[PDB]
Amino acid sequence: SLLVPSIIFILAYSL
């Protein structure tokens, strides 16, 4: 997984 996946979403801030 839930986290490992989450960290990604937030990454979208890059983009």
From Swiss-Prot:
Undergoes hyperphosphorylation of the C-terminal cytoplasmic domain after binding of the alpha-factor, which leads to internalization by endocytosis. N-glycosylated. N-glycosylation may be involved in the sorting process for misfolded STE2 protein. Induction: Expression is induced by exogenous alpha-factor. Expression is repressed by ITC1, a subunit of the ISW2 chromatin remodeling complex. Changing residue 6 to L: Causes constitutive activation of the mating pathway. It is found in: Cell membrane. Homodimer. Might also for higher order homooligomers such as homotetramers. Oligomerization is mediated significantly by transmembrane domain 1 (TMD1), possibly in concert with the N-terminal extracellular domain and TMD2. Interaction with GPA1, its dedicated G-alpha protein. It comes from the Eukaryota. Changing residue 13 to A/S/L/K: Impairs signal transduction. The extracellular N-terminal domain and transmembrane domains 1 and 2 mediate homooligomerization. The highly conserved sequence IXXGXXXGA (residues 53-61) is a glycine zipper motif in which shallow grooves in the alpha-helices interact with one another. Expressed in MATa strains but not in MATalpha strains. Belongs to the G-protein coupled receptor 4 family. Disruption phenotype: Strongly affects mating efficiency. The lineage of its organism: Eukaryota, Fungi, Dikarya, Ascomycota, Saccharomycotina. Disulfide bonds: none annotated. Fungal class D1 G-protein-coupled receptor that acts as an alpha-factor pheromone receptor performing pheromone-dependent signal transduction involved in cellular conjugation, mating projection assembly, and in cell fusion. Following alpha-factor-binding, the signal is transmitted via a tripartite G protein consisting of alpha-, beta- and gamma-subunits (GAP1, STE4 and STE8 respectively) that prepares the cell for conjugation. In the inactive state, the cytoplasmic end of transmembrane domain 7 (TMD7) is unstructured and packs between TMD1-6, blocking the G protein coupling site. This is Pheromone alpha factor receptor. The gene is STE2.
